[PDB]
Each structure stands twice: as structure tokens, then as C-alpha cells.
Nucleic acid binder design. Structure first.
Ligand SMILES: [K+]
Ligand SMILES: [K+]
Ligand SMILES: [Mg+2]
Ligand SMILES: [Mg+2]
Ligand SMILES: [Mg+2]
Ligand SMILES: [Mg+2]
Ligand SMILES: [Mg+2]
Ligand SMILES: [Mg+2]
Ligand SMILES: [Mg+2]
Ligand SMILES: [Mg+2]
Ligand SMILES: [Mg+2]
Ligand SMILES: [Mg+2]
Ligand SMILES: [Mg+2]
Ligand SMILES: [Mg+2]
Ligand SMILES: [Mg+2]
Ligand SMILES: [Mg+2]
Ligand SMILES: [Mg+2]
Ligand SMILES: [Mg+2]
Ligand SMILES: [Mg+2]
Ligand SMILES: [Mg+2]
Ligand SMILES: [Mg+2]
Ligand SMILES: [Mg+2]
Ligand SMILES: [Mg+2]
Ligand SMILES: [Mg+2]
Ligand SMILES: [Mg+2]
Ligand SMILES: [Mg+2]
Ligand SMILES: [Mg+2]
Ligand SMILES: [Mg+2]
Ligand SMILES: [Mg+2]
Ligand SMILES: [Mg+2]
Ligand SMILES: [Mg+2]
Ligand SMILES: [Mg+2]
Ligand SMILES: [Mg+2]
Ligand SMILES: [Mg+2]
Ligand SMILES: [Mg+2]
Lengths: 42, 90, 273
RNA sequence: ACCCAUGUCCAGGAUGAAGGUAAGGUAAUACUUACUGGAGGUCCGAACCCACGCACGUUGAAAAGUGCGGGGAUGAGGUGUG
RNA sequence: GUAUGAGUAGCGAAAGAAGGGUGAGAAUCCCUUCCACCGAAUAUCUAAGGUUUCCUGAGGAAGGCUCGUCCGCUCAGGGUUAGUCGGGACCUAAGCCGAGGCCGAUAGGCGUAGGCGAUGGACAACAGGUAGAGAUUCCUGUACCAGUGCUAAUUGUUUAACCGAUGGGGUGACACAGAAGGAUAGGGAAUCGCACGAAUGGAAAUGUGCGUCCAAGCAGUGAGUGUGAGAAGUAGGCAAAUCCGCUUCUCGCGAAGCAUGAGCUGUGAUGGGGAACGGAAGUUCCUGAUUUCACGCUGUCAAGAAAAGCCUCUAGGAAGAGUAGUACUGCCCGUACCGCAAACCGACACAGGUAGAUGAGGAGAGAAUCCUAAGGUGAGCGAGAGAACUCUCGUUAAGGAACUCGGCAAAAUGACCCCGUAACUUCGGGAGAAGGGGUGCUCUAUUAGGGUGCAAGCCCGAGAGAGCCGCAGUGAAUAGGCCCAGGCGACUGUUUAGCAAAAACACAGGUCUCUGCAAAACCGUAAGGUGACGUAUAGGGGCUGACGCCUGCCCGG
């Protein structure tokens, strides 16, 4: 089998906004993506 | 805010086919509730409402060349009235 | 008693078990059950700190009074029960109050007997007294290091201490290890050994049964790689190519005493095992 | 990979451990024969899991597979969700 | 950017044919008929995931490995209806966050209360119709849960009808295996009805085909399975208790009563569905579940979630209370479609992978296997020559391992029954050892005998004879090659995902060693944790590696 086995819950609870904003080093990711100007933050 | 809850009727062949059974397909605010829609219709047309149904629709993806975007998110209520009441016309 | 299994296949070729005569019921006390959840040597952090643990049959914690705070009240012994959470067995006790508790089963404790606690309790298997009020020579278990904390020291199966004297505020106790120790005299203990004396004699007989008991495989260091163990490596079977055998963290394994050299318990310890 | 909690899956057949009952047998035990019983990291064997051999593929149907055979298959089992 | 190879390799596992039709144009689209494929699936549901791919009408630029008049493609319009389904407003598990707090150069780490969090627990609706697209949603009928008001009766007022926790207690609340039963889904016979009654020698019936129904709910019943009953008194259940728990007496048990309880009978039904728009028959019997009773019973050891919800108990609150019938009320999200697949994961319309419920018949132990049913498909390049070589297959004179690193591969064995079965043995095994024989059909045969049943009838089918035919009778497919000797490792198991399955790892067992509990050891700066909710018959580390007989000398380093 293969390595992407999707799940919305897993996706969001790992890589999602609240998981980023829970963590000091995930708010930098968002600061850094807003600094490049990405249409999508997480 | 009845006139704000009830945005539009849904004029289509399905809807017209269904009007003869005293059922009316309205497009409504996506934050409305079934019960709000009931009392709003009863206000605005002086009918009696027996039952109110409701579905939510995602937006469809459309194109015009280089440019994609989803049509607006829709909420479609299907009111039905007590048989011993007066009709909404269209 | 012990039950040899006939060698009907090589998993049973030398399996032995218990026949479980001492046990009368198989329905524990729901009001005294609590849950347990396997940790598999994992930690606060999630890291495997203590190896060789994980993945057995699940268990419930049976709440066991080691303190014996219920003084003077008589308790009828109702039943003796298996506890997976210990080698010993546990005896259920209905007090005349209506309270129900469990205790360690002592050797010879029978269903139907009556149990007491406190200074007015005769020296009889099941009764718990302060070492202040226990005569020399008697055999005890479930000793506590501190009053009111609970019995803490001899609790396992077939296990017994023996009183040797007094030192005023203290009392000398030969624990099961041969260690004579000074323990306070306001510290309680039970009279008697422990019921499951046969426990040590059981041949598990099968790899799976240690798994069921919750015990993962032990891998030796002489097989590991040098990154993984100081006995690792060598282009074959290699001996312990070091001054001493070694744990996976240095720190010699054989003979090396790991007790702290400046411990507060030193002078309460009268004779090391 | 290891683990945690919670679930779920394993067609069908075979063998016949302890124990128990009865007859025989004894001063009484032994002990024998039958029947019952249903144990097992038990057997055979699909699903499921694995991957022993060979061939083919080898700018592949596929960045590790296909076909013919092969091992385990109530357990140290397989798998799902988190 | 364009060449070269080069009009080359390839066009991605498989059965199509013809006739009609549409159309500018047809191997490729639509229809029909024959044919073929899957069928414990190549069917039917449905999670997760994808997110409009669904339907309709136009279209053929590009995409589709060809083609295209078609599409999961492009445009444009439409389509997803819930008090009862599933998730929330109900509960909690692992885990996560975490007021305060404890730690810590900062940042932050841990963590109590508390709160989130299903893969689990609780919880009330069933059957039909639905011709473009949804259905326990809509519609038709019949109901259920919770609440509200309106009527009509009844009752209560402070020694208080009633409600009753934010607290207490019982249940909830549970493993694994085994066996036997009851019932039912299902399957199949006659029976009943409807149609046919026949092409090619024969048959007007021992003829052929098709079908031979219906819930939830309400009332009643019930294979049965569990369970002893009352009275007193209470050192206990953060306070309280009329409840639980404990104790003591009385009456004792294939007898009731109380809980559950599959299913069954009548209603529901003067309805619906259904083979000829209408509407026939709907009985009897056999087999029989992997479903349900039901983790109910029995046994075992490895000793098998919590909380809510339910019932009760008081603490309390109490002037309004419940009964019947009425009519009304009942929120949010999802609901299309795919869902062993061309729509998910794989860059592809990829021979890969993808959880669970159902999953029929003959023969059969069987979800094996062969053929098939319902139902789905005919796999997105073709036709035609039938040459070397390559691949997958099939058969081969005589010999039969001479091949070869090596019997690699292939061939052979193969199923049920019967006879019989060695050395050795840890007395269980070896052992399906080996080696051999028999299997078909017909009559004795509604069989000897069994199962079922009130009987009629309906299934299973034991030997035996007497015969018949073939080269051959598990006539197909599916289904062990065996033996002797030896080394290694006892064993089952694990291992280098993607060159090594092993004599390597583990294993039970042995032994040494450490450790007195704020154990030792480990993670971490510390707090905090594992260890362990354990306590030397326990825990950590090292070595050895079942079992048997044994394990010797040396302490100078
Ligand atoms: K769920
Ligand atoms: K079949
Ligand atoms: Mg809805
Ligand atoms: Mg260990
Ligand atoms: Mg190595
Ligand atoms: Mg090193
Ligand atoms: Mg070394
Ligand atoms: Mg060497
Ligand atoms: Mg050397
Ligand atoms: Mg086995
Ligand atoms: Mg085998
Ligand atoms: Mg294979
Ligand atoms: Mg097998
Ligand atoms: Mg699978
Ligand atoms: Mg996972
Ligand atoms: Mg060329
Ligand atoms: Mg070619
Ligand atoms: Mg098959
Ligand atoms: Mg379509
Ligand atoms: Mg094309
Ligand atoms: Mg929640
Ligand atoms: Mg549909
Ligand atoms: Mg659907
Ligand atoms: Mg093709
Ligand atoms: Mg030949
Ligand atoms: Mg020949
Ligand atoms: Mg040769
Ligand atoms: Mg040669
Ligand atoms: Mg071979
Ligand atoms: Mg081995
Ligand atoms: Mg490999
Ligand atoms: Mg290999
Ligand atoms: Mg060992
Ligand atoms: Mg500490
Ligand atoms: Mg070794």
C-alpha cells in the first residue's frame, strides 16, 4: 500500500489552524505563510 | 425579519410540479431555522404552515476562462401548508 | 496445588499451573473494582523507559486495605479470590458494620474465619496489630514503614518476616531478604505468611503465557550493534569484550552496588542481606 | 516499528488432554475396559495474513508486481477507528 | 524550440456477431436477438475518502492511448426534504487542553479541579408508492417518544396528594472456548392458481413454464433461561435515609411468584403487493442456519472499560398535583453519486491496495471446486496471415537424471471407505508412516434401519447379493510424493518494507547480580512520571537457551 491514507480529522488535528495557534512554533508558521502571502494558511 | 429570512422562491419544474400539493420552495438565509421559516411564512402570507422541510446546498464550481469559483451556498426550504388554508400563488 | 499438563504438544511438554483450590468465587466485588490501563513501560512523556513490558490480558484493580484502620470491629472472611495484579490471593471481608474490604490472604486463612485489628486482637493469622504489641519470634506480613500509610513491605506470595526484638521506639524485623531492619513500633503488620506458597514452582511452559502476563521479549546485548549496546558487535559470537558486563547505559551490571552511598535509611538498616 | 483504549474477523472438517460416571477388580487401593467430556502457541484446509522456490517482467500493467506452486490460519493471530 | 531513432516500440490481463436505427460520417453510439464472463463475485448495501463526478438538454475543439454521433469531457439549467436513520444539543475511554498550582536562563514543561474527545454505552417508525434525478426523510396508511395548552373528572394545603439531587446505593457492566437445544431467515418438494399444451421420432398428461405474500406498533401468549421470600436490629455507605450492605430468626426449593425472553396467534388487513388497466393462488410438508434466544448454560485461566441513562433512597422543594381524551408542538449537520472502483490511496480511465453487513442452487463437510440463479459485465484499438525467435500451455517413440552447482523446473502423488502399519520415543507421538484394496449404473429397494409427524406423507440411506457397460467408474475440476541416514537449531513464532527466512532473534527453563520502597534501573534541567497503583515466590540488568546426564582446575592479573 501507500503512504497517503487520508482523513479529515487527522489532517486538521495535526496540520490545522487550531493546532498551529496552540503552539508557539505553529504561530510562526502562520506568520511565515502570511509573510509570503499564501492564499491558504493550513 | 421575515422578508430577510425568505430571500426568493425557487421557480423550477420540480417546484411547479410540487405546488399542486400546496408545497412552496423558498430560498432562505443559511442561518435561518425551520421554525423561523414557519413563523415568517405565516406572517408574510397569512397562510397556516403545517410542516417545513429544509436542505442545504454546497456551491457548484463554475468557470469563465482562467477564473473558477463556487456559486453561492444555498439553503432551500420546502414549506407545506394545512389543506384548509389559502394558497401562496406565484 | 500444582497441576502438570500432559505433553499433548510441545507447548505443554513441561507446562505446569495452579489448580486454584484456595479460590471459592470467581465474581469479585463490583463496588471495590477500579480500572487499570496498560502503560507498557511508557511514561509521562510517552517514552519507553522500562523495557520488557506490554500487551497482556486486561485487568481491574481490586482495592485492597493494607492500612487496617478498622480497629476492634470483627470481619467475617467471605471468600478468597484471584487477583491478577498480585501473586498473592485476596480475601474478601464483610465487617459487622456492613463495610466490605479486601486484604492479602495469609497462609491458612480460611473462609468462615473472623478477623480483628488493633491492640485487643489475639495473635492469629489475619489479625493486624502495631509492632509495639506483637511478641518476638512471630511471623508477620504486610509491614508498613510509616504509621497510617499502609502495609508496604512483605506482601507477595509465600512471603514472611520475623520479629527479632525491640529498640525502644523501634522494633527489629527480619524481612524476607535476610535484612534485619529497624521499623517504628506504631507501625502495623499482619500475623501470618501468605497463602500462595506454590507460586514460585510454576513452569510457564510457553512463550505466549508470559505475553499474557504482560511481558515482551528480552533481547540480549551480545546480539545488538555497537550503537545500541556496549556488548554489541563482533564478527561472530563474541564474548563480553569488556572488563565487566554492562547494562545498555554503561554502569556495570554484575556485582556493582546501585544503592545510594549516603542514604537516610542506613542506620535503620541493622544488617544488610 | 513499538504501544494505548475501543471494536471487529477467522468456511468447514479432524484428533480426542485433564476430569467425571458406570461395569470389572480388590480386604481397600491399585489397575483395566467402555462411555462422557472438550483441552491444545494441536492437525487438515479456504477467506485473511505472510512471502519459500521458479519463471515472466526488467525505457515494467506495476519505482518491488503477475502466474504456477508455498507457510500460518483460536493465536506470541489478523485488521479497522482514534 | 526542433530534430534523430520512426511511422518505430506500445496502444495496459478477458468473446464477440449480425441485423435494424440515428447520423455529414459508424468495428466502436442506441435497440433487438443469439453467444460468452463473474457469481463468498466481476452481485446488493454501506463506512472512510473524493466532492458534483448524479439527472436532463445541447455539443465534439481538447481529454479518452484507436474511433466516436458517446463519456466520469465541455457548456447551460436542475437535483440531496428526517421529532424516530447516523453525529450534536446525552455519556464517557485512550489521549488532549488545563483556572489556580509545582517546576524551570527565557520561551515554556508537568499537572489538580474542570472540560473536550468515539472506534464504545444510551436513545422513539414501520410497510408500500415514487417512469429524470431523494427516501425508514417526500406521499399514502398505521404508530411510537418528549412536551405543551383545552376540556372532563379526581385529589391536596402546611404534622403537608406531588416532584425528588448537584449526594448515597443497585443495575448498566462486559473475557475466551466448548456443547446441546428452541425458534426463525433461508432453501426445496408436493398442493393451489394462471398460461401453454409443443417445431424433429414420442407424450392431453407421472406433461412444460411462472408464481404459490405482507411489516412496525397494539392485545394476548410463550421454547425457555435466570433467581429464593418475609419480619426484626443496624459501630458502615463525607451529613440523612423507609434504599444498599451486614447480622439474627420464621417459612423453605424441579412449586410458585418476579425479572427478562426469542418467536408465535389475532389485529394492523373490507389495505398494500402480485402472475393475466385490473387482479387469480398464497395451503401442507422436509431440510435448516455462521442469525436470534445468548456469554443463556458449562468449563478454563490469561481473571476479562468508564460515565451517563434507568430503579430506588433520603437531603430538599412544595400549592398545586397527576388520570383519560383531545389538538398542537418537536431545533442544528449529513443525506446527490462513486464506493474491489475509470470517481478513494497509487503522477495514468494503472493487472496493485481499500473496513464491515448480506452473500442463493446441484453434487458437496465446505464461503473449497465445476456449472449456474437473482443481478451485473462483454473491460476504450482493430482484421488477417497463421514464419522463425520469445512467452504461457498441451502431448510425445525407446531409455529414464546419463542433465545439472544441485532432480532447478516439470512430471508423479492427491478425495471417501477398508485392511495394515517399523526403528525410535520426552509414552503424547512417529502416523495420512509405509504398503495395498474398493469406488460407476440397474434390480432386489416406499429397503434393513433411523429422523419428523396425530396420521397421511417428507428427508438420511447399512451391509449384501444378483447382473450391465466401458481402456479407465473421487471417469471432469478441486484435494500429500514417499523412504533411509546425517549436521544445526528443541519446539509454535520473529527477522534485513524493496537480494539474505537461516544454523541468526525470541521462547519457556537455568544461573549470576543488584534492589528495604520516596527500591534499584530509566526519561527529563527540575517538577513530574514509568517501575507500580507493585513490594524480594516481586522488580531491573547480564549470560545461557526445551528435556536428559553433566558442567572440571586456576583468584597471579
Ligand atoms: K459511533
Ligand atoms: K457455492
Ligand atoms: Mg436535514
Ligand atoms: Mg526485563
Ligand atoms: Mg547483529
Ligand atoms: Mg559503545
Ligand atoms: Mg563486545
Ligand atoms: Mg569467532
Ligand atoms: Mg579472546
Ligand atoms: Mg494451530
Ligand atoms: Mg504444520
Ligand atoms: Mg499464490
Ligand atoms: Mg493450516
Ligand atoms: Mg484486507
Ligand atoms: Mg493508525
Ligand atoms: Mg528499428
Ligand atoms: Mg506492434
Ligand atoms: Mg471461489
Ligand atoms: Mg452521467
Ligand atoms: Mg481521440
Ligand atoms: Mg462530548
Ligand atoms: Mg439514486
Ligand atoms: Mg444514495
Ligand atoms: Mg484494452
Ligand atoms: Mg518420452
Ligand atoms: Mg512411453
Ligand atoms: Mg551427474
Ligand atoms: Mg556432465
Ligand atoms: Mg521442485
Ligand atoms: Mg527454529
Ligand atoms: Mg528482502
Ligand atoms: Mg526472500
Ligand atoms: Mg530466560
Ligand atoms: Mg522522582
Ligand atoms: Mg546463544
Amino acid at each position: 500500500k501507500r503512504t497517503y491514507q487520508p482523513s479529515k480529522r487527522k489532517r486538521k488535528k495535526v496540520h490545522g489552524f487550531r493546532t498551529r495557534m496552540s503552539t508557539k512554533n505553529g504561530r510562526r508558521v502562520l506568520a511565515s505563510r502570511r509573510r509570503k502571502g499564501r492564499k491558504v494558511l493550513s | 425579519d421575515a422578508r430577510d429570512i425568505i430571500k426568493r422562491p425557487v421557480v423550477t419544474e420540480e417546484s411547479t410540479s410540487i405546488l399542486d400539493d400546496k408545497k412552496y420552495t423558498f430560498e432562505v438565509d443559511t442561518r435561518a431555522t425551520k421554525t423561523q421559516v414557519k413563523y415568517a411564512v405565516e406572517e408574510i402570507f397569512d397562510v397556516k404552515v403545517a410542516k417545513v422541510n429544509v436542505m442545504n446546498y454546497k456551491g457548484k464550481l463554475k468557470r469563465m476562462g482562467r477564473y473558477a469559483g463556487y456559486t453561492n451556498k444555498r439553503r432551500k426550504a420546502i414549506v407545506t401548508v394545512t389543506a384548509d388554508s389559502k394558497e401562496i400563488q406565484f | 496445588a500444582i497441576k502438570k499438563y500432559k505433553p499433548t504438544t510441545n507447548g505443554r511438554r513441561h507446562m505446569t499451573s495452579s489448580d486454584f483450590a484456595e479460590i471459592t468465587t470467581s465474581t469479585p466485588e463490583k463496588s471495590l473494582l477500579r480500572p487499570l490501563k496498560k502503560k507498557a513501560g511508557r511514561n509521562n512523556q510517552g517514552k519507553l523507559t522500562v523495557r520488557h513490558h506490554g500487551g497482556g490480558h486486561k485487568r481491574q484493580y481490586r482495592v485492597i486495605d493494607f492500612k487496617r484502620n478498622k480497629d476492634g470491629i470483627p470481619g467475617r472472611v467471605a471468600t478468597i479470590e484471584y487477583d491478577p495484579n498480585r501473586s498473592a490471593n485476596i480475601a474478601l471481608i464483610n465487617y459487622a458494620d456492613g463495610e466490605k474490604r479486601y486484604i492479602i490472604a495469609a497462609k491458612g486463612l480460611e473462609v468462615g474465619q473472623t478477623i480483628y485489628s488493633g491492640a485487643e486482637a489475639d495473635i492469629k493469622v489475619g489479625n493486624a496489630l502495631e509492632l509495639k504489641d506483637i511478641p518476638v519470634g512471630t511471623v508477620i506480613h504486610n509491614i508498613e514503614m510509616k504509621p497510617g500509610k499502609g502495609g508496604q513491605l512483605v506482601r507477595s506470595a509465600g512471603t514472611s518476616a520475623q520479629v527479632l526484638g525491640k529498640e525502644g521506639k523501634y522494633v527489629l524485623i527480619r524481612l524476607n531478604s535476610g535484612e534485619v531492619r529497624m521499623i517504628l513500633a506504631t507501625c502495623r503488620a499482619t500475623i501470618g505468611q501468605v497463602g500462595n506458597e506454590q507460586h514460585e514452582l510454576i513452569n510457564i511452559g510457553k512463550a505466549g503465557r508470559s505475553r499474557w502476563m504482560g511481558k515482551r521479549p528480552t533481547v540480549r546485548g551480545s546480539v545488538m550493534n555497537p550503537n545500541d549496546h556496549p556488548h554489541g558487535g563482533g564478527e561472530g559470537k563474541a564474548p563480553i569484550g569488556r572488563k565487566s558486563p554492562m547494562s545498555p547505559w554503561g554502569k556495570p551490571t554484575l556485582g556493582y552496588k546501585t544503592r545510594k552511598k549516603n542514604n537516610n535509611s542506613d542506620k535503620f538498616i541493622v544488617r544488610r542481606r
